[PDB]
């Protein structure tokens, strides 16, 4: 289907266009013509990807001069799969329309977990195992050894890729992980290493945010490619949370106890290994004294160690002070460790600034910032130099060195917090430290600097006005798009009023208030009989969820709920999560019905999409406020008051609202999809909170459905279900909300879609 | 909390966490109860190591590792006379060489014969007395004050 | 029948306080042939939120601090965990009695979520057109 957008012909691969796409593709084209970053809050229920991918290919096709490569990224691998398969349909039409007359290379990327073929590493269950063992099978020393004695342990797939994969550009085509795996199986090459090398040649690539947000995790695109490359992000509100998460570090006394044993093992190993070899030890000092020591970097580009989380500017090419000598370096690490253990001995929660902590170090252990900045550099060099195999076991020592490097490098804007116990152990001493970085923008700063245009595309974030402040960012466009439908798919409502007139809420600082729990149980019980297939319940906190369920079970409410639908309760165990979701998804499809309950913050709201019959109703119990860990939150809130002048109450509202919008945002992914959504908290009735929800969702959140009684919601639900359970087929969708090629050739499509876009 | 106990008397660790370890040149852990015992008799030597000590020769140092305890005191003592900055060197490389030499001095002072160390101490001390010993101490002290001033201002 | 209200079957406690044996008492060993030594049947296509994040490669690599510590364990939580474990194990095990599991589960969940019935994939009938021959026969 030839779609022309403001003079740009787009080869759409399907029979119809969702009218929202053209306003979004216009704004996307406009931001690309302006060659700048932009915010586009496009509802998750639309095929925003297909249109986005199509316009990118059209823009790349039409302007290879302006755009060199597209680097898409989505938080989860299943989204990468759907994107790759949705791109396949796009390329299929482009290839059919062109007869494969133009080259195109689409490439999936992920960790070795999903890109290892070697039978000794592929079955390993965790990244430590995979990376440790793979490095043990391919590393500068492993390779050098194997290259002079092929009997030594090695990963054959690397050697094959090294021998044959190198300098062999892949033929144009979309290569999914399964495709690259098969090609790796076929050619016997590491698909992980094959991908990395081939990214230079690829036209489109999809990454996990970490490859771009995390500085220690792989960074494979230089400024040269970024300068003319387009960056596209799912509008995962977590993006700011991940920036700090990719840059923050927590040190616990348990970790130090592991680090101590690890350091002892290494130091004793240094003895016997020094008797094993010493010339290489001296050679390190030589290359270190001679400067960058940087002549092994290409084979250290073939190294399973994370980078230094010191970003570009943070990194330095100076000599690592007087920590060159491993024996003295071991002492330096020991001095920091003991100082930390002593610094962690503090009986109570204390917060420090990076310069204050550095001042304490200089005050007692006299450790200096500059040598401490090269700590990780010294360690990564040492790690290879000592030829140590047990990288997984060496991880706690790596963390400490990186943390020290980070603390010594990001001396401004960040802060440290010391706590003698964890939030999980307020009663018992669990001394911990959190390197709480606060300016998430500093992670995206290099991206905005390296890349030509970073565009965020899903409809989950709101208000858009707060993200340029929070991310200290300035987009070219700040737009939103209205869900355009002939038959609405969504009925957001605030059932904040109990039948007993109790104000259903969690306003009481999450205090034990049975009356709201009781009302929550009544609502859920009756709603379980009203909603078909599956239900998805999100609690504000895991504690409150557990406290609530215990009450409903004690009050017997939970048994009446079981009679209605099979309950599946989430827990931190991946076994529980996987089994619950396994049984829930199929229970929603077998004769019975299931009801998933989880927490609005947990990964369950992140990794699982409630498409169609799965989670036909999403219920948000209470406003999702995290009043636990208030100290760290206060610090970040305070810093936002300082450099950004953002009110804590304003931010708190936003932060909870975006989580509610996540659960709701994942409740629908298509037009033949719909979701009931109850916001069981009076709070949501405030014009401010309602006003900060996504504008395309607010459209359906009509005042008449605010602070509804439980009975009203049940009746409205029965009505809403009755009104949409009715047959409405593909042919009925051509009236409105779906435009065929005939409608695209009709200029009406150009004028009608203009009003679908929104701005903030 | 983390220390299992002193070889001389460990009851203090189980009794209360407020007490602090006493460091000695002996590089041997001792505690407050031992302090009283040495004051009444045998103040001149370590209770088991037998190494001579000037009366108590006890100082408060809360590190668990006596080697870090000794090295930190060695650090200050060594640094106090090896205040040379990169300014005194043509490059960071030569500076780091000197700094590594100081690490050798530290290790030698920690585990080797002090003859060369003592001679090297005295020679640099006497030669650089004005600039490295005194002038650098002043500049360094000024920076400590200036840092404290920045911290005070932020507070 | 009076003793039946004891523990697991009526109050859902943790350890084998059941009035009629309990192999689900070791609920971690009862779950070993479901999500430990064995696994679910969709564990790649879905239910894989245990290994999606940057926490999968390394634990302390995250800012993780919420999970159950080795410090400060509680029996109040054990009662909550028992209710959860009992209800989850009951639901999962009971469901398995009616649900053996299938090799198509993963591919089904992939196609069900990748294909869109709006943009494509129609649904059409396949009856047969009834063209009568010598309709005069019915007329007469
Ligand atoms: S070299 Fe390639 S195939 Fe071998 S373990 Fe590493 S990623 Fe897997
Ligand atoms: Zn003692
Ligand atoms: Zn002694």
From Swiss-Prot, chain A:
One of its GO terms (cellular component) is cytosol. Changing residue 541 to R: In XP-D; mild. It comes from the Eukaryota. A motif (DEAH box) lies at residues 234-237. A motif (Nuclear localization signal) lies at residues 682-695. Residues 438-637 are annotated as: Mediates interaction with MMS19. One of its GO terms (molecular function) is metal ion binding. It is an enzyme of class 5 (isomerase). Changing residue 681 to N: In XP-D and COFS2. Interaction with GTF2H2 (p44) results in stimulation of the 5'-3' helicase activity of this subunit. DNA unwinding by this subunit in TFIIH is stimulated 4-fold by XPA and 20-fold by ERCC5/XPG. It is found in: Nucleus; Cytoplasm, Cytoskeleton, Spindle. Residues 7-283 form the Helicase ATP-binding domain. It catalyses: Couples ATP hydrolysis with the unwinding of duplex DNA at the replication fork by translocating in the 5'-3' direction. This creates two antiparallel DNA single strands (ssDNA). The leading ssDNA polymer is the template for DNA polymerase III holoenzyme which synthesizes a continuous strand; ATP + H2O = ADP + phosphate + H(+). Optimum pH is 6.5 for both helicase and DNA-stimulated ATPase activity. [4Fe-4S] cluster binds at residues 116, 134, 155, 190. PROSITE patterns: DEAH_ATP_HELICASE (PS00690), HELICASE_ATP_BIND_2 (PS51193). Gene3D superfamilies: P-loop containing nucleotide triphosphate hydrolases (3.40.50.300). ATP binds at residues 42-49. GO terms for biological process: apoptotic process; bone mineralization; central nervous system myelin formation; chromosome segregation; determination of adult lifespan; embryonic cleavage; embryonic organ development; erythrocyte maturation. The keyword S-adenosyl-L-methionine does not apply. Its cofactor is Mg(2+); [4Fe-4S] cluster. Belongs to the helicase family. RAD3/XPD subfamily. Interacts with GTF2H2/p44 via the C-terminus of this protein; mutations in the C-terminal region of XPD do not alter its helicase activity, but prevent its interaction with and helicase stimulation by GTF2H2/p44. This is General transcription and DNA repair factor IIH helicase subunit XPD. It comes from Homo sapiens (Human).
UniProtKB/Swiss-Prot annotation, chain B:
The modification N-acetylmethionine is found at residue 1. Residues 142-155 form the UIM domain. One of its GO terms (biological process) is response to calcium ion. Keywords: Acetylation, Cell cycle, Metal-binding, Nucleus, Phosphoprotein, Transcription, Transcription regulation, Zinc, Zinc-finger. It comes from the Eukaryota. Highest levels in colon and testis. Moderate levels are present thymus, prostate, ovary, and small intestine. The lowest levels are found in spleen and leukocytes. It is found in: Nucleus. A zinc finger (RING-type) spans 6-50. GO terms for molecular function: cyclin-dependent protein serine/threonine kinase activator activity; zinc ion binding. The modification Phosphothreonine is found at residue 51. GO terms for cellular component: CAK-ERCC2 complex; cyclin-dependent protein kinase holoenzyme complex; nucleoplasm; transcription factor TFIIH core complex; transcription factor TFIIH holo complex; transcription factor TFIIK complex. Its main location: nucleus. Associates primarily with CDK7 and cyclin H to form the CAK complex. CAK can further associate with the core-TFIIH to form the TFIIH basal transcription factor. Stabilizes the cyclin H-CDK7 complex to form a functional CDK-activating kinase (CAK) enzymatic complex. CAK activates the cyclin-associated kinases CDK1, CDK2, CDK4 and CDK6 by threonine phosphorylation. CAK complexed to the core-TFIIH basal transcription factor activates RNA polymerase II by serine phosphorylation of the repetitive C-terminal domain (CTD) of its large subunit (POLR2A), allowing its escape from the promoter and elongation of the transcripts. Involved in cell cycle control and in RNA transcription by RNA polymerase II. This is CDK-activating kinase assembly factor MAT1. It comes from Homo sapiens. The chain holds residues 1 to 155 of 309 of the full protein.
Swiss-Prot record, chain C:
Component of the 7-subunit TFIIH core complex composed of XPB/ERCC3, XPD/ERCC2, GTF2H1, GTF2H2, GTF2H3, GTF2H4 and GTF2H5, which is active in NER. The core complex associates with the 3-subunit CDK-activating kinase (CAK) module composed of CCNH/cyclin H, CDK7 and MNAT1 to form the 10-subunit holoenzyme (holo-TFIIH) active in transcription. Interacts with PUF60. The modification N6-acetyllysine is found at residue 20. It is found in: Nucleus. This is General transcription factor IIH subunit 1. (Microbial infection) Upon Rift valley fever virus infection, interacts with NSs leading to ubiquitination by the NSs-FBXO3 E3 ligase and proteasome-dependent degradation. It comes from Homo sapiens (Human). The lineage of its organism: Eukaryota, Metazoa, Chordata, Craniata, Vertebrata. The chain holds residues 221 to 384 of 548 of the full protein. The modification Phosphoserine is found at residue 113. Component of the general transcription and DNA repair factor IIH (TFIIH) core complex, which is involved in general and transcription-coupled nucleotide excision repair (NER) of damaged DNA and, when complexed to CAK, in RNA transcription by RNA polymerase II. In NER, TFIIH acts by opening DNA around the lesion to allow the excision of the damaged oligonucleotide and its replacement by a new DNA fragment. In transcription, TFIIH has an essential role in transcription initiation. Belongs to the TFB1 family.
